[PDB]
Amino acid sequence: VSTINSTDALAMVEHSSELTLSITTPVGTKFVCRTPFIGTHTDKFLLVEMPKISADDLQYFFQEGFWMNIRAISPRGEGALIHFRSQLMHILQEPVPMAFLSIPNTMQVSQLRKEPRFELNLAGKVLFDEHRGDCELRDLSRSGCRFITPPLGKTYQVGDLVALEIFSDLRGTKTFPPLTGKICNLQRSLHHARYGLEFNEEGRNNAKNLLAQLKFNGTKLTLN
């Protein structure tokens, strides 16, 4: 792991992303919860939304002065795991429930992935048994990828073997050879279902060729 200044570290974290708060009371009792990162006020405070927890834990584990270990994630490229200690300084209910946490001078950062994931937005179809539904590739690596599907579309579970046919252009006809792999992770949202995939040998060869046709436009990878 590496130690870097808090301004630079937090700059790697997208606002609204999820933070993992591990709180340790004065007696030693631990408590972990998740909550959205709002942002920072100057160099004085780290702002987060009040955790979606019980009103009992909320006032027995979430009190001013209590310390906690916070984990944040930087999604781009090889990604990064960010860890640091912070003290709960202030709690407000109005105009909206939120917490002000202290910002240490430095934070620890560690590599999250073996290789980088490249962002993109490529429409395609996902194959699974008799199903063939719409999907969009959101990121691609040499070993895997991320794709999303409609909330009402067929769902997959970790371990399922699927294949993605990515359109080579807007015609919605011709596609790159199948990207085959197993679902490794998933996360349902209100606007779509997300899946992480790890390619089998054939998938890796086809991904390699697809990456070879993509160009970086300063923001993400794009097709011709």
Added chain:
Amino acid sequence: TVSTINSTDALAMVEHSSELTLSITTPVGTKFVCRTPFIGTHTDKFLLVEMPKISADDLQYFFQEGFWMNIRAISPRGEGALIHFRSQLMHILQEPVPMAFLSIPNTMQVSQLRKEPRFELNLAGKVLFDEHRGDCELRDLSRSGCRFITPPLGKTYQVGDLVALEIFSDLRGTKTFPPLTGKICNLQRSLHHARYGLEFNEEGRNNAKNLLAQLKFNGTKLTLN
């Protein structure tokens, strides 16, 4: 190119802590323009911003709950984008720290910001201006210009100044690429460094084309081979 986008997706494009431009039109018709840092958003309820660093007068006068304003935000990656929308100052807090809560409309306008993409990188180098030579680091590059940073205590430049950047072609700094020459177009000092935007002259464009051709994209940004 102009399009309408839902606020959640549009604000996801804006980096937290970045400067917002607020154009306020009081209920009289009086207009005021100030800038202030974007903090973030709470759920899909409020847009949080730090209090503008303006005089108390203009403050209690142009910055009051209920007042409306047109906000301009920036999406900095690549060709970037200009995000424009209308918002109402809903709440003003003083404790524990001064901050304002603005309303978030359902949709926002997204329009073109740049004529071409800017590619991020981190290349150490030297900045030359008149008889001075100082350390700098190239932060982004495009066919027509670049962005570079310098130490807080180093020699400063003003818009219009013609400078030259000698970027090292290797980690050890055993040599430099042909110079990136052009005029300063914008600047901004921050806690850890001074930042400048530059627009190349002919020579600059030629050498920038040469430099870009030697860089690879590692998924996060361009780097030396």
